[PDB]
Amino acid sequence: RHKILHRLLQ
Amino acid sequence: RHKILHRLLQ
Amino acid sequence: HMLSDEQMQIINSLVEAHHKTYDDSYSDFVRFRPPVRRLSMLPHLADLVSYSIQKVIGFAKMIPGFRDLTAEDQIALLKSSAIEIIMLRSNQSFSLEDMSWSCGGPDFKYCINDVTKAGHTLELLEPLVKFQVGLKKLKLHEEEHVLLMAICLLSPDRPGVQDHVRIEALQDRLCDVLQAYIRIQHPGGRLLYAKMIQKLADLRSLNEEHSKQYRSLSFQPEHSMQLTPLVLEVFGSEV
Amino acid sequence: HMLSDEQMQIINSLVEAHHKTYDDSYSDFVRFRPPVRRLSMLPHLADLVSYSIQKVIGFAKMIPGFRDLTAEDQIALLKSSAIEIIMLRSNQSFSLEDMSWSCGGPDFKYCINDVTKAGHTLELLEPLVKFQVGLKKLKLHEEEHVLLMAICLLSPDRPGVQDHVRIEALQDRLCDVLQAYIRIQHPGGRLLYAKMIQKLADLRSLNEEHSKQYRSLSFQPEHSMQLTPLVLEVFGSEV
Ligand SMILES: C=C1CC[C@H](O)C/C1=C/C=C1\CCC[C@@]2(C)[C@H]1CC[C@@H]2[C@@](C)(O)CCCC(C)C
Ligand SMILES: C=C1CC[C@H](O)C/C1=C/C=C1\CCC[C@@]2(C)[C@H]1CC[C@@H]2[C@@](C)(O)CCCC(C)C
User: Fold this and answer.
1) Of C33, C36, C227, which has the smallest distance from its Cβ to D229's Cβ?
2) Number of domains making up chain C
3) Candidate of D21, D23, D24, D86 to mutate for ligand 2, largest count of ligand atoms within 8 Å of Cβ
4) Binding site for calcitriol: residue ranges of C?
5) How far apart are CA C94 and CA C28, in angstroms?
6) What is the CATH classification number for the domain harbouring C125?
7) D221 touches chain B (CB under 8 A)
8) C6: how many CB neighbours lie within 10 A of its CB?
9) Phi/psi zone of residue D2: left (φ > 0), alpha (ψ -120 to 50 degrees), beta?
10) D232: domain range?
């Protein structure tokens, strides 16, 4: 999923 | 899943 | 009329449960991520909600018949009622003078503005403040306040509830002790039970509006990452 | 020997990236759940680790060629190296005098004892302190320190890495600028590059021990609920 990581990576 | 809830409910 | 030993022991267990789970000193509030006065109040209020959820679980476990229910029913009732119990129990810190929740020092004084700084709009904050005002004006005895929380939690009309029959029998027994308490122990409370039942309908509408607004913040990872694991689990859509 | 404009611009981008992501003032530490001196230090250190992960993501995004990689490779490298970069970057606050990490006031002075109060044992804390001491004794220039972090993050030998070839080409180019920097800019550093490469092997062993100990706390919901959503996601076993 990695929703936060995906968001923080733009 | 509710791992925390299951734990807090004993 | 007079209330039975069975009804009296239900009251005794509920106020004892509430005294064990509601810290009038608010001494743990210093342990939360500090208040900041975008979404500057979100870390502090997420910590406050997370702490309150634990207290609601603790209260629920002391309600007669709650622990006897299935783990699935216990989780369904808490996932659905959690925010309504938090709004009910928050009424103890609510001040009619400041139109804010006061929890010790001025650091833990939460006004309507601080709550907008956690992502909430006036579509929720206006009915919520109006709810707190009317609840406070009811001048509920501690016995009535704790019975209302227990009736709210043990509502059978919640999604995920399997043993509707058992849960409704527990809620009906709780409503009977409330009606009998108001009748024999609350002077001039002939209209109070009906007013309390209306507050439960108001809570449902507040839960609806809160779920909409929570969905708005949980869908933004930069905001959802500021919540706690317990808030995510309890306000989550998992079944 | 002399280093090229291409190698010089790699250095310039890396120290600029580190200056943007490492706040020498430690001014945000006041926003974390306060330190408490079971597992009394866990909320504060979970907040500190969560904040550090965001800073590592920020640094990684400024590494030439990192943003160009696939989102899956970017996530694999960060999920695997995150704790090693945190241990490396923590060396800036480490004091040989106190054998502790000092971050402004005495509230943000973390000794070996505070870390045991977050669930860690001496099986991790003994090699970690011994690592910090030897890293500090290397007296690395800021240029070497930032190159080491970038080499650590861009390691191709990590689980989940798909484009091994591309990642190894980026890491080899980074090792070449480090060897050339030490040779022409670090006086009496003929043995330094080899000592720095050994520190990367020590980091792998520390990551192993940290993963074991993290597994011990993540499997206890009463402890895992104290972590942050970002810590759970990054140190999680999801692929
Ligand atoms: C939780 C307690 C009980 C103990 C004390 O009486 C203090 C108190 C206050 C509750 C408040 C004042 C701040 C905003 C809240 C807590 C609101 C009750 C609900 C509301 C909320 C709608 O904004 C929830 C925020 C949810 C976010 C963080 C996802
Ligand atoms: C993260 C930074 C960078 C900025 C500053 O220099 C301060 C600093 C300190 C790092 C420390 C001191 C406390 C314990 C830690 C942070 C350790 C580095 C790793 C270690 C750890 C192993 O205990 C992680 C804890 C993981 C838990 C919370 C799951």
Assistant:
1) C227
2) 1
3) D86
4) 22, 52, 89, 93, 120, 210
5) 18
6) 1.10.565.10
7) yes
8) 10
9) beta
10) 1-239
